[PDB]
Design a protein around this motif. Structure first.
Motif, short mmCIF file in Angstrom:
data_model
loop_
_atom_site.label_atom_id
_atom_site.label_comp_id
_atom_site.label_asym_id
_atom_site.label_seq_id
_atom_site.Cartn_x
_atom_site.Cartn_y
_atom_site.Cartn_z
N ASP A 17 0.80 -1.23 0.00
CA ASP A 17 0.00 0.00 0.00
C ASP A 17 0.84 1.29 0.00
O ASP A 17 0.30 2.42 0.02
N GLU A 18 2.16 1.11 -0.08
CA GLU A 18 3.12 2.21 -0.07
C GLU A 18 3.60 2.57 -1.46
O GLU A 18 3.43 1.79 -2.39
N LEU A 19 4.22 3.73 -1.55
CA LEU A 19 4.69 4.30 -2.82
C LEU A 19 6.16 4.71 -2.70
O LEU A 19 6.55 5.43 -1.77
N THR A 20 6.97 4.21 -3.61
CA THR A 20 8.38 4.57 -3.67
C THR A 20 8.53 5.95 -4.30
O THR A 20 7.94 6.24 -5.34
N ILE A 21 9.31 6.81 -3.67
CA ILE A 21 9.43 8.18 -4.10
C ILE A 21 10.89 8.56 -3.95
O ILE A 21 11.59 7.94 -3.14
N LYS A 22 11.32 9.56 -4.72
CA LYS A 22 12.69 10.09 -4.64
C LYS A 22 12.69 11.59 -4.31
O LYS A 22 11.79 12.34 -4.72
N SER A 23 13.69 12.02 -3.56
CA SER A 23 13.82 13.42 -3.23
C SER A 23 13.69 14.28 -4.51
O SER A 23 14.28 13.94 -5.56
N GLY A 24 12.91 15.36 -4.45
CA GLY A 24 12.71 16.23 -5.60
C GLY A 24 11.49 15.92 -6.45
O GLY A 24 11.08 16.73 -7.26
N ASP A 25 10.91 14.74 -6.26
CA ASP A 25 9.75 14.30 -7.04
C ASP A 25 8.54 15.15 -6.71
O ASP A 25 8.30 15.48 -5.55
N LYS A 26 7.74 15.45 -7.73
CA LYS A 26 6.52 16.20 -7.55
C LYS A 26 5.38 15.20 -7.36
O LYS A 26 5.34 14.17 -8.02
N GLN A 42 0.38 10.63 -5.13
CA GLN A 42 0.55 10.09 -6.48
C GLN A 42 1.64 10.86 -7.15
O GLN A 42 1.61 12.08 -7.14
N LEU A 43 2.59 10.15 -7.75
CA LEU A 43 3.65 10.80 -8.51
C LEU A 43 3.09 11.44 -9.77
O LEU A 43 2.44 10.79 -10.58
N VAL A 44 3.38 12.73 -9.95
CA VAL A 44 2.89 13.47 -11.10
C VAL A 44 3.31 12.82 -12.42
O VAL A 44 2.48 12.66 -13.32
N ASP A 45 4.58 12.45 -12.54
CA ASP A 45 5.08 12.01 -13.85
C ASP A 45 4.63 10.60 -14.22
O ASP A 45 4.16 10.39 -15.33
N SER A 46 4.74 9.66 -13.28
CA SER A 46 4.43 8.24 -13.53
C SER A 46 2.97 7.87 -13.26
O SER A 46 2.46 6.90 -13.82
#
Length: 60
Positions: A17-26, A42-46
């Motif tokens: 139920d988690e989401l992988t994210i990177k510093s700087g991601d919108k 929710q990641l904007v790009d993907s």
């Protein structure tokens, strides 16, 4: 995009139920009402979505 944020730390999903994210991601902030610890984003790009630590998300 009702509410937006910028990720401040890398976070790798350890459960479904988690989401992988990177510093700087919108992100879109889908739910910041249920928990002060975990926000649905929710990641904007993907378009990938899931729960992340609230304290890693800076609202715009």
């Amino acid at each position: 995009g009702m509410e937006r944020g910028i990720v401040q730390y890398d976070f790798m999903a350890e459960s479904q139920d988690e989401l992988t994210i990177k510093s700087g991601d919108k992100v879109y902030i889908l739910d910041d009402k249920k928990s002060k610890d975990w926000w649905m984003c929710q990641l904007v790009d993907s378009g990938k979505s899931g729960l992340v630590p609230a304290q890693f998300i800076e609202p715009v």
